[PDB]
């Protein structure tokens, strides 16, 4: 597939994170039981609750779709539906909220992702969501400074960073060691855990610039319009085709008075410097 448009490394990051054929780099290896601790829907070693009998010991509606779509393992077992939630700093988080949903719904079977500015939640059957949490906490989409596991009190994505480059957390779920190592000392909703969970050191600024999916005209990020005109070129095109269609769905752009001459524009001028500070 094409996935998305864009000519810059940020656009390629987007395409990779969306691409199931692309294997995401692993930065850490959090043990499953520590994952369970962090989510705090259950205690490690505790058996999965059921909201209904396993599908196999049940007669389903005579539905063609149920017939041809395999349930996930969590669904087959009748697991509860629980969730994992991340907050992504505007300061070059490796992945951004919208791209999380693109990633999730391309890569995973049977998920319910929701995108907001300061939180992205994914819901799925409990055992399924535990597996997704590990994958997403382990890999390059989670930075221990610019990403946070937060099921409530998410404030901070747009707040300035602290001295060490950590994103603000009002519940203080994390603790930072002298060597930069980040440990979670509370669960993802700020509850007490029986033990601390080490996540690891933050990526460097250069690495963050390299890995991020955001365009950001500050602190050396990619300047969308100056560095990647293709990006808005194609987004604008979508915009105008929706515009024409709402008026008359059958209409072609060429039949419109003052319609676009082409994709893109000839005379876009910018009114900020690179890095924006003046």
């Amino acid at each position: 597939p094409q996935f998305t448009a864009g000519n810059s490394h940020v656009a390629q990051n987007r395409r990779n994170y969306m691409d199931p054929s692309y294997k995401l780099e692993k930065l850490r290896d959090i043990p499953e039981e520590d994952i369970v601790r962090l989510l705090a829907h259950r205690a490690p070693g505790e058996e999965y609750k059921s909201i209904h009998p396993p599908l196999e010991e049940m007669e389903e509606p005579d539905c063609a779709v149920r017939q041809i779509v395999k349930p996930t393992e969590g669904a087959a077992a009748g697991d509860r539906i629980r969730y994992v939630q991340y907050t992504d700093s505007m300061f070059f988080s490796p992945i951004t909220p919208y791209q999380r949903a693109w990633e999730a719904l391309n890569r995973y079977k049977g998920v319910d992702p929701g995108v907001l500015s300061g939180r992205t939640i994914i819901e799925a059957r409990e055992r399924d969501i535990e597996k997704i949490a590990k994958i997403e906490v382990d890999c390059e989409l989670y930075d221990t400074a610019r990403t946070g596991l937060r099921g409530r009190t998410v404030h901070g994505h747009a707040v300035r960073l602290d001295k060490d480059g950590m994103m603000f957390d009002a519940l203080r779920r994390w603790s930072r060691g002298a060597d930069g190592t980040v440990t979670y000392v509370k669960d993802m909703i700020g509850g007490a855990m029986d033990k601390e969970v080490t996540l690891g050191k933050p990526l460097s600024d250069a690495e963050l610039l390299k890995k991020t999916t955001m365009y950001r005209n500050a602190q050396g990020g990619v300047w969308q319009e100056a560095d990647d005109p293709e990006s808005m070129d194609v987004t604008a095109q979508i915009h105008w085709k929706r515009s024409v269609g709402g008026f008359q769905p059958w209409a072609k752009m060429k039949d419109i008075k003052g319609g676009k001459k082409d994709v893109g524009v000839k005379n876009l001028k910018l009114f900020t410097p690179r890095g924006g500070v003046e």
């Binding site: 779509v69 719904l105 079977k109 992702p113 995108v115």
Partner: protein
């Protein structure tokens, strides 16, 4: 324009069907489905009997002491049912129908089409008027007691404009609760529809899209060339035209993701010549255009529904549908540089329904939405059928499920052949 119609198992039902043949304005099956939808009431006589005996004859949390009467309506169920039928009849052999169900605990009422002169809400009123006189006459209720019967049957009406606390239950609502002229057939909860097709997803989507598109006509949205786009959406998304819908689900149902369906749909659109290169961007990315935008929209809407079915059926749960529709639209746009289903309106409704199914502010799970709902009304017919599909697929993971909210409809409306097999009904009539 021509399409082939296929059933929920990928088997062809009709070929070379002119697009007009499945129009709500012309298809006898659709017209019948509409007619049944406004005429057919369901009554829980056992519960009504209990209302009278306990004085619980008003609204929620209300009880009137001292007006308890024991009226053997379930006992005399056969007499009541016949009195009603005779009152509803306008002429012998007409389409009047009344049936007792579950040993007379429950009753179906269908006033004849002829009693509806102007106002579709006669389906409710004729039944309510007939039922209360039936009870009074059959159970020999005295003048003094007559008003309690009115309350049992009509609820809080007229003090409350909504007779919802009363005895006769319809799929549709009273005219006042409709959000605009022509919204009549939109005011039908997803859970009621899901119950009605007995939780078979494609029948639910189909039935729901047949009602939505009929409403679209009634709203005035299908005049002139605008019509074609709606008929294409209905045929492809709702009726599995040329097996695109079933095919997308079948091909991805084992280990496919939502994105997989979307991309498979883009590739089919290309193969079928629906979309073609417009311009190649510096990165190599190709923006596509479509000579026939309405047809592309039909293909996109089908992609949308198929993506919803695949993901929700994987989870065997309904809650994913709004976020599914959102990324379906978003991703199909990013893949092609063309506009998503209903030119952005479907994505819009997916945002609001995502919000109002995961927040404190209103809505609920998908089963409490419907085409008339302020949250989900925005798309021009293509959106709500996905919801019904999702709540059919739901394995009772949700609290407000059709089993909880809509059992009565499943039981009473479930055996109506046009409701049970809407696609075959349409395909037959389109021949």
């Amino acid at each position: 324009d021509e399409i082939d119609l296929y059933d929920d198992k990928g088997k062809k039902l009709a070929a070379g069907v002119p697009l007009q043949n499945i129009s709500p304005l012309k298809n006898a099956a659709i017209k019948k489905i509409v007619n049944l939808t406004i005429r057919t009431g369901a009554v829980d006589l056992a519960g009504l009997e209990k209302k009278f005996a306990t004085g619980a004859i008003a609204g929620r949390g209300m009880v009137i002491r001292g007006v308890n009467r024991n009226l053997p309506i379930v006992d005399k169920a056969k007499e009541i049912a016949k009195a009603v039928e005779d009152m509803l009849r306008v002429e012998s052999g007409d389409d009047t129908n009344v049936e007792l169900i579950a040993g007379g605990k429950r009753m179906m009422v269908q006033p004849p089409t002829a009693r509806i002169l102007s106002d579709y809400s006669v389906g409710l009123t004729a039944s309510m008027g007939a039922l209360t006189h039936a009870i009074i006459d059959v159970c020999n209720v005295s003048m003094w007691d007559a008003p309690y019967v009115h309350a049992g049957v009509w609820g809080m009406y007229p003090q409350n404009p909504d007779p919802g606390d009363g005895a006769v239950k319809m799929l549709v609502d009273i005219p006042m609760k409709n959000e605009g002229p022509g919204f009549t057939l939109r005011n039908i909860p997803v859970n009621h529809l899901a119950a009605t097709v007995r939780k078979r997803a494609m029948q639910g989507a189909g039935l729901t899209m047949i009602l939505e598109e009929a409403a679209q006509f009634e709203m005035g949205n299908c005049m002139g060339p605008h019509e074609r786009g709606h008929l294409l959406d209905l045929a492809y998304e709702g009726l599995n035209a040329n097996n695109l819908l079933y095919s997308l689900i079948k091909d991805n149902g084992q280990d496919g993701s939502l994105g997989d369906v979307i991309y498979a749909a883009v590739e089919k659109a290309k193969a079928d010549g629906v979309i073609k290169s417009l311009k190649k961007m510096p990165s190599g990315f190709t923006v596509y255009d479509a000579d026939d935008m309405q047809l592309w929209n039909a293909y996109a809407c089908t992609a949308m529904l198929a993506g919803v079915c695949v993901n929700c059926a994987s989870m065997r749960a309904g809650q994913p549908v709004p976020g599914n529709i959102m990324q379906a639209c978003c991703l199909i746009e990013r893949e092609t540089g063309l506009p998503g289903p209903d030119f952005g309106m479907a994505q819009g409704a997916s945002v609001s329904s995502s919000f109002f199914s995961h927040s404190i502010y209103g809505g609920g799970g998908p089963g409490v939405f419907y085409g008339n709902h302020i949250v989900t009304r925005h798309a021009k017919g293509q959106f709500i059928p996905c919801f019904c599909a999702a709540m059919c697929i739901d394995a009772d993971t949700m609290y407000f499920s059709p089993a909880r909210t809509s059992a009565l409809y499943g039981e009473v409306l479930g055996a109506i052949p046009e409701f049970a097999e809407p696609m075959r009904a349409v395909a037959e009539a389109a021949k």
